[PDB]
Tab-separated table of C-alpha atoms in Angstrom:
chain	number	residue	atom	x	y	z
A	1	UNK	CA	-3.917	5.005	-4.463
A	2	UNK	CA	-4.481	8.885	-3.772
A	3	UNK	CA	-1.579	10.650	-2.285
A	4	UNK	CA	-1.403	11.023	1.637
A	5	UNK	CA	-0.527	14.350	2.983
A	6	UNK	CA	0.190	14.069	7.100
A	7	UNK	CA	1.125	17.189	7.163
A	8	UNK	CA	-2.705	18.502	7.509
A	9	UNK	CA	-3.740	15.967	10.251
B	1	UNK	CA	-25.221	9.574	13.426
B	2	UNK	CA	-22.396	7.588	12.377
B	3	UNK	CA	-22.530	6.656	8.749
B	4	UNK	CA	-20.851	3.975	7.070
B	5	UNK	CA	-18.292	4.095	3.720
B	6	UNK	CA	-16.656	1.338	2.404
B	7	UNK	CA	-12.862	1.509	1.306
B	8	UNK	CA	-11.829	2.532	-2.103
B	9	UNK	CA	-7.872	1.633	-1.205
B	10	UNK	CA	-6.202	0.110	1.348
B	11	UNK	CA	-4.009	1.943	3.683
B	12	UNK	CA	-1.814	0.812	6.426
B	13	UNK	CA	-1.953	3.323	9.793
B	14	UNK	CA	1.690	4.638	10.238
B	15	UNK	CA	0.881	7.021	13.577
B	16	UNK	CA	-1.013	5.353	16.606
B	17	UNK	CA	-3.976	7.851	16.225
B	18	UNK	CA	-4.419	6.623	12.432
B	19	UNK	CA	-6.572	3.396	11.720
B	20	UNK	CA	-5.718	0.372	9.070
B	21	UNK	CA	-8.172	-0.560	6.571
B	22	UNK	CA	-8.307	-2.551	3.758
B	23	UNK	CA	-9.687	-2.036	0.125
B	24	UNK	CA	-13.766	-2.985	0.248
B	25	UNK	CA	-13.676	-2.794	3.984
B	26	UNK	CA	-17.131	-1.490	5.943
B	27	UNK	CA	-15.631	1.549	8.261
B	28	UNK	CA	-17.839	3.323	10.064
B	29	UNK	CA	-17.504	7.778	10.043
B	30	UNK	CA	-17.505	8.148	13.926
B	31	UNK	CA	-16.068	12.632	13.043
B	32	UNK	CA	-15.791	13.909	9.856
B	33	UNK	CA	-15.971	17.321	11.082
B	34	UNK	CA	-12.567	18.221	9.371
B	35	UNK	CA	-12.409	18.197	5.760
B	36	UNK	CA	-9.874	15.721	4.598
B	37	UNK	CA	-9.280	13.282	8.014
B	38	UNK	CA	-12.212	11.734	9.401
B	39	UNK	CA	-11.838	9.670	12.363
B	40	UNK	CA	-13.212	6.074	12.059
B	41	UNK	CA	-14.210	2.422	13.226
B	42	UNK	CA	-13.992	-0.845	11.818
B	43	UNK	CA	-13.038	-4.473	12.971
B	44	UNK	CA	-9.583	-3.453	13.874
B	45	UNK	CA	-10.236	-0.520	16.800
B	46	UNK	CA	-10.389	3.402	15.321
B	47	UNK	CA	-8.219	5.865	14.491
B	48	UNK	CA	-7.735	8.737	11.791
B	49	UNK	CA	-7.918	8.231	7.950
B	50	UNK	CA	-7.972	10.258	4.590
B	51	UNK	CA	-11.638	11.616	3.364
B	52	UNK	CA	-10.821	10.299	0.006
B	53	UNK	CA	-9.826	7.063	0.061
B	54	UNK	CA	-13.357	6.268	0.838
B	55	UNK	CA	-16.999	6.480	-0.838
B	56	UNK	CA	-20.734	6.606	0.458
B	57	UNK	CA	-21.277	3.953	-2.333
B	58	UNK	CA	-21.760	0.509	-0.086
């Protein structure tokens, strides 16, 4: 699984 | 017009504007006018998810 970054939403 | 991806991965929506999909899944690309979160459809309602945990491969 690629990592998630929320941060840019 | 919307075009469809299928899921590479699943991933499980942890905000309410994010949507839950599951790996092989149909979702339909309702915006991808940013770059890496594209809002989409599927069975389950619509909502945000990553660019790249999808392909244009069907």
């Amino acid at each position: 699984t690629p990592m998630v970054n929320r941060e840019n939403k | 017009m919307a075009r469809r991806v299928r899921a590479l991965y699943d991933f499980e929506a942890v905000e309410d504007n994010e949507l839950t999909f599951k790996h092989g899944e149909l979702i339909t690309v309702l915006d991808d006018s940013d770059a890496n979160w594209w809002q989409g459809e599927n069975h389950r309602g619509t909502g945000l998810f990553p660019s790249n945990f999808v392909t244009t491969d069907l």
